[PDB]
């Protein structure tokens, strides 16, 4: 355990957090993994969805390479303040935080080859502009965009670690209103005027379920409309009955529409 | 020995097929974030049943009855390694009397009303017409009020089926 202590002291001593790995060299490639713990508040009112994730970043830093210790050094999370970490940020987020009980849910893991794993437990609300014209018979595309704030492709490069297996846990997700038909990962360099900036994007296609609406809204409307036709089979002279039936069907339909407007 | 006082909001997936006659097992799971099974392992101080103690007065539940707790331990194999996960499951059963008095029983009496129309003389056409259509309106109001007090799940709960069947009954009576 002591030898590990002087090893860690050697690594951290003379370490400049201001300089990225391969500062003068080629760009540092940052692999990314996500494990979706939950997707909770898919809000049509606010045009956003809440998502909890384990977000891992992998990158090789030769300064932190060590030898003579054949095990992966999982260090206390506070050392993340002492190491360089990427400039990653979620472009479309509105409110995000790291869970902080019992401690800040961070993980720093060094490997003998110099690889650094940086894991964060993040709950973030992300904007998802919904076209609800076909509501409730609608399908939404909700995306999470990941970008580097202050680095271009000549300095930092993003990729999905493990290919299409980079994002996991989507198969285990289920929403009360939606079902995840498909999820996609795409990596691309946004060619901004200053330069090309790396970007990753995780998209979900959500299909709304209509069991709610077949019972709540469509069936009472259909049956009230059917009841409105009973007036045709009543004699023309029975003015009170036919009038009461028709106008009370109007009132019931108004009640349905108004209370549906309130609830939805 | 390291003691803390915490307030934890935790996810509880619920199968609301049998609402309000449904029962749930809400989990509380914890473990090390960074250290895998080969580095840090959690254990219960005493026997697992007696290592999670609920206070006698500590049941702040309105619509649920906390039947008991089940304490266990397990392993989770994540993308970063295997982790020991210590879990508790609180077993909750919903209280049904509210939905009996507020939803089921008014719906039953409204269906009984809609059926009482058959005992009026057939020549009271306006009376029976108004009676049936106003009964349909009453069921509409009751159904709206009932579903105001549910979460926005997709599939049909038991009380939804009860309301739909009663609504079909008043429709068929008219």
């Amino acid at each position, epitope marked *: 355990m002591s030898f590990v202590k002087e090893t860690v002291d050697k690594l951290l001593k003379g370490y400049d957090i201001r300089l990225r790995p391969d500062f003068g060299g080629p760009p540092v490639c940052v692999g990314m993994n996500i494990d979706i713990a939950s997707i909770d508040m898919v809000s049509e009112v606010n045009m956003d969805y809440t998502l909890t994730m384990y977000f891992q970043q992998y990158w090789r830093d030769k300064r932190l390479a060590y030898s003579g210790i054949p095990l992966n050094l999982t260090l206390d999370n506070r050392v993340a303040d002492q190491l360089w970490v990427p400039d990653t940020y979620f472009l479309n987020d509105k409110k995000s935080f790291v869970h902080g009980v019992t401690v800040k849910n961070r993980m720093i893991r060094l490997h003998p080859d110099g690889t650094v794993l940086y894991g964060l437990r993040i709950t973030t609300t992300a904007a998802c502009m919904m076209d609800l014209r076909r509501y409730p018979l609608d399908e939404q595309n909700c995306t999470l965009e990941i970008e580097s704030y202050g680095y271009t492709t000549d300095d930092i490069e993003f990729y999905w670690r493990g290919g299409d297996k980079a994002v996991t846990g989507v198969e285990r997700i289920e929403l009360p209103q939606f079902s995840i038909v498909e999820h996609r990962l795409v990596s691309r360099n946004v060619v901004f005027a200053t330069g090309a900036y790396p970007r990753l994007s995780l998209s979900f296609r959500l299909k709304r379920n209509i069991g709610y609406f077949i019972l709540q809204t469509y069936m009472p409307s259909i049956l009230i409309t059917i009841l409105s036709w009973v007036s045709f089979w009543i004699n023309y002279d029975a003015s009170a009955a036919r009038v009461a039936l028709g106008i009370t069907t109007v009132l019931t339909m108004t009640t349905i529409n108004t209370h549906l407007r309130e609830t939805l | 020995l390291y003691t803390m006082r915490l307030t934890v909001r935790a996810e509880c997936p619920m199968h609301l097929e049998d609402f309000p006659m449904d029962a749930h*097992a809400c989990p509380l799971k914890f473990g090390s974030y960074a250290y895998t099974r080969a580095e840090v392992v959690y254990e219960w101080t005493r026997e697992p049943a007696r290592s999670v103690v609920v206070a006698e007065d500590g049941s702040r539940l309105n619509q649920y009855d906390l039947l008991g707790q089940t304490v266990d331990s397990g392993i*989770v194999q994540s993308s970063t390694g295997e982790y020991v996960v210590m879990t508790t499951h609180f077993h909750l059963k919903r209280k049904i009397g509210y939905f009996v008095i507020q939803t089921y029983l008014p719906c039953i009496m409204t269906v009984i009303l809609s059926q009482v129309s058959f005992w009026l003389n057939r020549e009271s056409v306006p009376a029976r017409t108004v009676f049936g259509v106003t009964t349909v309106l009453t069921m509409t109001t009751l159904s709206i009020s009932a579903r105001n007090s549910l979460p926005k799940v997709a599939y049909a709960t038991a009380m939804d089926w009860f309301i739909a069947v009663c609504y079909a009954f008043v429709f068929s009576a008219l």
Partner: nanobody, 108 residues
Framework: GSLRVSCAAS????????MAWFRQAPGKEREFLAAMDQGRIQYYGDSVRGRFTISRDYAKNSVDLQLDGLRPEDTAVYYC?????????????????WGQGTQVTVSS
């Protein structure tokens, strides 16, 4: 000897349910073996801890049990079960769905 017992579920999606395996040797006693919940958390019985491994395919809605290190006393009928664990997660009464079973025999 090594073996793998798979269980495919049809008729309902068991993403939120706890999928488990039980064993029944001759003499009519059902024994809990392994279980996995929605969080991929694996619970095991003491008798088969570290030997049998339980996994789930949520896309295919199936649960697999890999059996390594079989001994003659493991000869029994293995049942696949599903259901939310109420008062349970180690009791057969908490599972509302059960499989036909699979007979496994070991000879020395």
């Amino acid at each position: 000897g090594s073996l793998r017992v798979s269980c495919a579920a049809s008729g309902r999606t068991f993403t939120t349910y706890i999928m488990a395996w039980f064993r029944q040797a001759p003499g009519k006693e059902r024994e809990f073996l392994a279980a996995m919940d929605q969080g991929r958390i694996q619970y095991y019985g003491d008798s088969v801890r570290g030997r049998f491994t339980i996994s789930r395919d949520y896309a295919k809605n199936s649960v697999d049990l890999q059996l390594d290190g079989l001994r003659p006393e493991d000869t029994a009928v293995y049942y696949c079960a599903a259901g939310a664990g109420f008062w349970g997660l180690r009791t057969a009464s908490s599972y509302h769905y059960w499989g036909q079973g699979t007979q496994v025999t070991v000879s020395s």
